[PDB]
Amino acid sequence: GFAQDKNPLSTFGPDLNEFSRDVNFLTLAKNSDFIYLRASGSGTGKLRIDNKFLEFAKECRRLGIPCGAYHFAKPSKDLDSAVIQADQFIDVLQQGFGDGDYGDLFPVLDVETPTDKSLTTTELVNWIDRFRDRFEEKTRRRLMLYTGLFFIGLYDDFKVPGKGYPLSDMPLWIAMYTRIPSNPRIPPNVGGWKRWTMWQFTDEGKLDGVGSPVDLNWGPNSIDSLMPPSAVTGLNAYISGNKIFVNWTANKEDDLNGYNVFVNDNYAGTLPRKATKIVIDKSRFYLPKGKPIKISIEAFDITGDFSKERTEYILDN
Amino acid sequence: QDKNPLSTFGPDLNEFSRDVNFLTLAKNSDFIYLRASGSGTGKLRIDNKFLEFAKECRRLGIPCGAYHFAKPSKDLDSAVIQADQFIDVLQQGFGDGDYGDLFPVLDVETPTDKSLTTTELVNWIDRFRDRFEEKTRRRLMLYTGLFFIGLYDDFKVPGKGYPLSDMPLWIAMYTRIPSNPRIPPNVGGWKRWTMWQFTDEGKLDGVGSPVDLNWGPNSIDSLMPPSAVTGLNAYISGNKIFVNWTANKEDDLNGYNVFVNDNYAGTLPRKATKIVIDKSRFYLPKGKPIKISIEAFDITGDFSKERTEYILDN
Numbered sequence: 172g173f174a175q176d177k178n179p180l181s182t183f184g185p186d187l188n189e190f191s192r193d194v195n196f197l198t199l200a201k202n203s204d205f206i207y208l209r210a211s212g213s214g215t216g217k218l219r220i221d222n223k224f225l226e227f228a229k230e231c232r233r234l235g236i237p238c239g240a241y242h243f244a245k246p247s248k249d250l251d252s253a254v255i256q257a258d259q260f261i262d263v264l265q266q267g268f269g270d271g272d273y274g275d276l277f278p279v280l281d282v283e284t285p286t287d288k289s290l291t292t293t294e295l296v297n298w299i300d301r302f303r304d305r306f307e308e309k310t311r312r313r314l315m316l317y318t319g320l321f322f323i324g325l326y327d328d329f330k331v332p333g334k335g336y337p338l339s340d341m342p343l344w345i346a347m348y349t350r351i352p353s354n355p356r357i358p359p360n361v362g363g364w365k366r367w368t369m370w371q372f373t374d375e376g377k378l379d380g381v382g383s384p385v386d387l388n389w390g391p392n393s394i395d396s397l398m399p400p401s402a403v404t405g406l407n408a409y410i411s412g413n414k415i416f417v418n419w420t421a422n423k424e425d426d427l428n429g430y431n432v433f434v435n436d437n438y439a440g441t442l443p444r445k446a447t448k449i450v451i452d453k454s455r456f457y458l459p460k461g462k463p464i465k466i467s468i469e470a471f472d473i474t475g476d477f478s479k480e481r482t483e484y485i486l487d488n
Numbered sequence: 489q490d491k492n493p494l495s496t497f498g499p500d501l502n503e504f505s506r507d508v509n510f511l512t513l514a515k516n517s518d519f520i521y522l523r524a525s526g527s528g529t530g531k532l533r534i535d536n537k538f539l540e541f542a543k544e545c546r547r548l549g550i551p552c553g554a555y556h557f558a559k560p561s562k563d564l565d566s567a568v569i570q571a572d573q574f575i576d577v578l579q580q581g582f583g584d585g586d587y588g589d590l591f592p593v594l595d596v597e598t599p600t601d602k603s604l605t606t607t608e609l610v611n612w613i614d615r616f617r618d619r620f621e622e623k624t625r626r627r628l629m630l631y632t633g634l635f636f637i638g639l640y641d642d643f644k645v646p647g648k649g650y651p652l653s654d655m656p657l658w659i660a661m662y663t664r665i666p667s668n669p670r671i672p673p674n675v676g677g678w679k680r681w682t683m684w685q686f687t688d689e690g691k692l693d694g695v696g697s698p699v700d701l702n703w704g705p706n707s708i709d710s711l712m713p714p715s716a717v718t719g720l721n722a723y724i725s726g727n728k729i730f731v732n733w734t735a736n737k738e739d740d741l742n743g744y745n746v747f748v749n750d751n752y753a754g755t756l757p758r759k760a761t762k763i764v765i766d767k768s769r770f771y772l773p774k775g776k777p778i779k780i781s782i783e784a785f786d787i788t789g790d791f792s793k794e795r796t797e798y799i800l801d802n
């Protein structure tokens with residue numbers, strides 16, 4: 172087996188909730204690459220919005236601090252509750268970040284329960300997987316999974332009989348605290364996950380800008396790897412002959428993986444990460460003579476998030 | 489960037505290669521490039537062995553690609569024409585609608601006298617590339633030499649940066665030339681080379697004559713489009729379509745596009761094996777079959793040659 176340490180480029184930031192004391196976001200803006208907030212949770216037996224989420228998320232956005240949020244899961248044998256909780260989380264996220272906006276960072280499902288024997292590994296993973304399917308279908312945003320190394324170990328490494336590791340394609344935020352002497356020094360490779368995306372290495376950290384002992388995390392080498400890419404800039408198009416010539420400024424994200432281009436919302440092609448142009452054959456589209464033509468584009472990154480908005484260029488035609 | 493334990497390896501051949509034994513090459517080469525055509529003489533010529541060599545590589549399952557010996561000029565129409573000609577010849581060798589297993593290659597080695605500006609040369613290559621990729625939906629790789637790049641100002645175009653730096657680069661730099669560095673230097677705005685022709689005088693079992701030899705990417709897949717997706721399945725439940733497939737296995741896999749009756753339904757990342765589609769987003773009459781189709785794509789933007797389909801009866 173092998174393991175994955177942090178490195179000099181690793182990003183860093185806390186996660187917080189309504190019980191975090193004395194949080195000065197202006198101070199955190201100077202020392203944190205990102206902040207995670209609790210949005211909601213069902214740990215008490217019903218859905219509760221975190222009582223500081225709206226305030227915390229508004230101030231992080233105001234200060235330009237990359238901000239994401241998590242839902243504390245209550246899994247069960249009834250898979251309808253995964254759909255309900257996913258829908259509730261989707262609703263709360265928009266309350267915090269805006270209509271149709273689910274945060275700067277990956278939305279997170281926080282799974283820490285149950286730790287008795289009440290669910291089989293198949294039942295627990297099926298519940299998470301259903302939550303993931305609903306969440307991503309509804310938002311077009313990737314969902315990151317938070318859980319602890321101990322918890323994974325209680326559930327057989329999240330290995331499902333007959334099915335391998337169904338959650339191993341989720342981004343992983345793994346908790347393994349170095350303050351526990353029996354823990355390894357760095358996160359081992361587990362659950363079929365090739366890599367961790369974030370590592371929560373303490374629940375008792377000291378960081379200027381949070382008064383209470385705080386959860387601290389290592390992240391990817393680039394903040395871009397936690398966020399969707401930005402909208403494309405410099406979009407331009409012209410018609411010559413029977414072709415539409417489209418060009419744009421290259422997106423700059425470290426995790427950029429390509430672009431999709433559309434003509435009147437019909438797909439026109441997929442380009443790789445270094446691309447800055449496409450030539451489109453007009454005959455493939457119903458383009459009434461004299462009517463305007465909408466060219467639009469989205470970037471997407473390695474883990475499959477897209478530009479929140481599609482930059483547009485209207486050809487008068 | 490040097491070669492390394494994973495680097496692929498293979499010759500490039502043309503009609504002047506002597507005593508070629510493809511059975512031997514199938515055991516010692518990851519890939520073979522062939523000359524398809526050239527325009528150096530002022531007229532399109534087809535390499536006299538290309539069809540024979542391509543057929544034998546396909547018969548033995550040797551990954552096979554081909555190149556066009558360019559004749560750049562100040563006349564940009566000639567770039568469109570040579571691209572269209574290269575497109576035709578490739579299909580003669582590889583089959584209708586088939587442009588080879590490996591990146592098709594534009595081979596640029598002329599002119600070396602003072603007869604073209606850097607802007608003119610780069611614009612010609614760029615126009616060939618645009619026409620070729622537009623017509624084939626296949627990425628074009630550029631072959632050229634380190635000396636040639638230096639001759640044309642590092643392919644830096646005044647006011648335009650390095651317009652060719654997004655092309656895969658097959659760079660020739662012969663270690664037998666003492667003034668050359670021992671590994672390719674960074675040039676032309678290219679972050680990396682895709683292939684490195686390191687000799688024109690190599691000795692390779694299965695080729696009788698001194699032969700061009702090349703280091704390629706760490707994975708043969710990085711020279712080829714991804715395979716068609718397999719294991720595609722779909723069903724309807726409620727107002728949704730649940731689609732799943734087997735994961736493609738290419739080392740350079742980058743994702744999938746899924747379509748509903750040829751309409752775009754989404755892009756998935758490389759580890760994905762399912763998508764849930766809301767029927768409400770597509771025109772889906774009761775009693776009309778629904779075509780689900782999918783393609784894989786790789787990091788440099790080539791696609792599965794065919795889309796795998798699954799027909800739902802609805």
Ligand SMILES: [Mg+2]
Pocket residue numbers: 395396397398399400424426472473476
């Ligand atoms: Mg990203």
Ligand SMILES: [Mg+2]
Pocket residue numbers: 709710711712713714738740786787790
């Ligand atoms: Mg490939």
